[PDB]
Amino acid sequence: MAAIRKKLVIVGDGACGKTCLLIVFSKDQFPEVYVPTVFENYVADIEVDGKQVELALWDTAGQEDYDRLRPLSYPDTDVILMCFSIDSPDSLENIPEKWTPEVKHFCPNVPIILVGNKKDLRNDEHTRRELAKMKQEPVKPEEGRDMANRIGAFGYMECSAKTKDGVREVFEMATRAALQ
Amino acid sequence: FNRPILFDIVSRGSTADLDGLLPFLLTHKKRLTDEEFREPSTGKTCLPKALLNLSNGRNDTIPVLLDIAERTGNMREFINSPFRDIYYRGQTALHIAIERRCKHYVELLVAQGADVHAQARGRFFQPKDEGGYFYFGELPLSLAACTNQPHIVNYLTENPHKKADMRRQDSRGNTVLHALVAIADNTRENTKFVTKMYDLLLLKCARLFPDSNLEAVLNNDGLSPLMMAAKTGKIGIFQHIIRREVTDEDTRHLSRKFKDWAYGPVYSSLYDLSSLDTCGEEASVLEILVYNSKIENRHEMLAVEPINELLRDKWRKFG
Amino acid sequence: PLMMAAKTGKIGIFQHIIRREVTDEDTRHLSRKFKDWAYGPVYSSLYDLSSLDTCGEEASVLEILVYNSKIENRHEMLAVEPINELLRDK
Ligand SMILES: Nc1nc2c(ncn2[C@@H]2O[C@H](COP(=O)(O)OP(=O)(O)O)[C@@H](O)[C@H]2O)c(=O)[nH]1
Numbered sequence: 001m002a003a004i005r006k007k008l009v010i011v012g013d014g015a016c017g018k019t020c021l022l023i024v025f026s027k028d029q030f031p032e033v034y035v036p037t038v039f040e041n042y043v044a045d046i047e048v049d050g051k052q053v054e055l056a057l058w059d060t061a062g063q064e065d066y067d068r069l070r071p072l073s074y075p076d077t078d079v080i081l082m083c084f085s086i087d088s089p090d091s092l093e094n095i096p097e098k099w100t101p102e103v104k105h106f107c108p109n110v111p112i113i114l115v116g117n118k119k120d121l122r123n124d125e126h127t128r129r130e131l132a133k134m135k136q137e138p139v140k141p142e143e144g145r146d147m148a149n150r151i152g153a154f155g156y157m158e159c160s161a162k163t164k165d166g167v168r169e170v171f172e173m174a175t176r177a178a179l180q
Numbered sequence: 181f182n183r184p185i186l187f188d189i190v191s192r193g194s195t196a197d198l199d200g201l202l203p204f205l206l207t208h209k210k211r212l213t214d215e216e217f218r219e220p221s222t223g224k225t226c227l228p229k230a231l232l233n234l235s236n237g238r239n240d241t242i243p244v245l246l247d248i249a250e251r252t253g254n255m256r257e258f259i260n261s262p263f264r265d266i267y268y269r270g271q272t273a274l275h276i277a278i279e280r281r282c283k284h285y286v287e288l289l290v291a292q293g294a295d296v297h298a299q300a301r302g303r304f305f306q307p308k309d310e311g312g313y314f315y316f317g318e319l320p321l322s323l324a325a326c327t328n329q330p331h332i333v334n335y336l337t338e339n340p341h342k343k344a345d346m347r348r349q350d351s352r353g354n355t356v357l358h359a360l361v362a363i364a365d366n367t368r369e370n371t372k373f374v375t376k377m378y379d380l381l382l383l384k385c386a387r388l389f390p391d392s393n394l395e396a397v398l399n400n401d402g403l404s405p406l407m408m409a410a411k412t413g414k415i416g417i418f419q420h421i422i423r424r425e426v427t428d429e430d431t432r433h434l435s436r437k438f439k440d441w442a443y444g445p446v447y448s449s450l451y452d453l454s455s456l457d458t459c460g461e462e463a464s465v466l467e468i469l470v471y472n473s474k475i476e477n478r479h480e481m482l483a484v485e486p487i488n489e490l491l492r493d494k495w496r497k498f499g
Numbered sequence: 500p501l502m503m504a505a506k507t508g509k510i511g512i513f514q515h516i517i518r519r520e521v522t523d524e525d526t527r528h529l530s531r532k533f534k535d536w537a538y539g540p541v542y543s544s545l546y547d548l549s550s551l552d553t554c555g556e557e558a559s560v561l562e563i564l565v566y567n568s569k570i571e572n573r574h575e576m577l578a579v580e581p582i583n584e585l586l587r588d589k
């Protein structure tokens with residue numbers, strides 16, 4: 001029948017795999033060299049239970065003037081995909097301080113999902129050494145659930161855009177929450 | 181080169197001054213959808229400016245801009261870029277090309293990959309009750325239907341590339357048939373093209389989808405087009421829907437009035453008591469008319485041929 | 500001059516002075532209804548609030564129109580774009 005359209009907004013810190021996740025979901029191909037700052041004006045076809053849903057993927061950035069026009073993307077949203085890097089936890093601790101209030105103040109009563117992008121780096125030796133140089137450890141799944149507890153988000157799933165693992169169930173959960 | 185220069189070259193339609201845009205964009209790695217080429221507080225790119233400043237109905241800068249955008253990679257982003265302002269949010273270039281009554285550029289945009297199901301959510305695209313001017317259903321196909329443009333409707337529903345399905349609903353749930361009821365006045369001309377387009381779309385949806393009835397998809401308020409016509413004080417489309425007769429055998433099941441027999445001037449016709457006397461388990465047009473139809477047309481809709489006798493027949497039975 | 504117009508109930512000159520724009524680049528200091536953007540009917544503008552400010556440091560035209568002005572055009576002069584919008588803002 002008619003394919004409903006749901007508005008999806010992906011917010012997160014700089015270089016936390018937002019645009020890469022969107023491109024992997026949409027074009028099925030991980031960008032090699034030229035990854036855009038924002039993946040904009042794309043609608044993706046998805047089906048969860050036979051109900052076709054067109055996900056209007058909206059991308060936000062915090063660089064140059066994109067920070068100023070990021071608030072204008074929030075109106076009419078249906079699901080919010082807050083993004084943090086498993087590699088660098090600084091995004092994880094800065095979620096509740098900045099991103100959760102920002103999302104809630106412009107998107108009341110809207111489902112919230114926080115996703116652990118860069119899941120492949122959890123076991124990466126280089127990233128582990130870089131974190132140990134700064135006395136840090138990769139975000140644990142238990143830590144992700146603990147962060148979701150503070151916000152009260154719809155769910156927490158980890159994504160690895162480079163390996164194309166988890167890039168589908170996250171959007172399925174997002175459109176399921178939007179369908180509510 | 182720069183947006184004040186670009187929006188003037190586009191406005192004047194001078195392709196001779198637009199030659200150097202592509203080498204500049206390629207060597208600077210800039211794109212036509214960049215904020216440096218978009219009007220602030222509006223979000224308008226060069227394409228709406230070209231679609232607004234039309235001389236002789238054509239702007240030669242539009243093909244050049246489309247070619248340049250394809251070369252730079254921003255084709256879908258360039259064509260489907262929506263307005264970001266409060267009063268025009270969601271308005272892509274397809275809505276502008278349809279409202280300007282330029283079928284050629286509508287075909288050009290849809291062929292290149294325009295978002296045919298783009299919803300315009302600005303305050304100017306809200307019902308007059310909610311503080312708006314032009315509520316057309318928020319869809320590019322609904323805009324064409326409410327603008328009385330049958331050729332553009334036929335093209336959008338019969339594209340080789342991407343066809344606008346007629347069963348789609350906007351944020352409020354109104355389909356094309358629901359949007360033809362909110363743009364319908366009681367004047368003779370409005371009641372003469374709104375009903376024609378309503379029948380055109382209903383028959384098109386009956387042929388294209390035999391198993392689906394486009395008049396049975398309720399909006400977010402649970403109102404079918406007949407129910408919304410009864411509620412919002414539209415009598416012409418109300419009478420047309422109730423007294424509907426269609427001759428085509430393939431789509432003869434959409435009739436609501438069935439001439440049972442005829443003897444000279446006298447003829448007996450069966451009226452479908454669907455959504456009118458539904459025995460309570462569903463919503464009824466009669467209840468909407470006698471409770472929620474505060475319009476002054478209530479005493480004129482309570483005189484339609486089935487409704488007037490439907491109420492009277494109830495009086496004899498148990499009344 | 501604007502205060503005199505408000506007191507004497509001159510609707511035309513008060514309406515002009517409130518929304519006066521000087522297109523010349525040499526003197527943008529005298530314009531009041533600055534224009535930000537304008538697409539179609541929308542003519543979104545930024546009205547100066549000089550002599551119309553909320554603060555009571557200097558004489559306020561809102562006070563003059565509400566209390567001092569006894570002219571029959573008082574209702575007409577309160578219907579200008581910034582003054583009416585200013586009251587709803589409060
Ligand atoms: N190892 C790994 N690297 C990634 C993944 N996703 C993105 N990256 C890299 O992270 C960089 C920044 O990602 P990007 O999407 O540009 O950040 P954004 O614009 O803030 O979303 C990119 O250049 C990618 O190469 C991932 O899942 N695993």
Ligand SMILES: [Mg+2]
Binds near residue numbers: 019059060
């Ligand atoms: Mg990005």
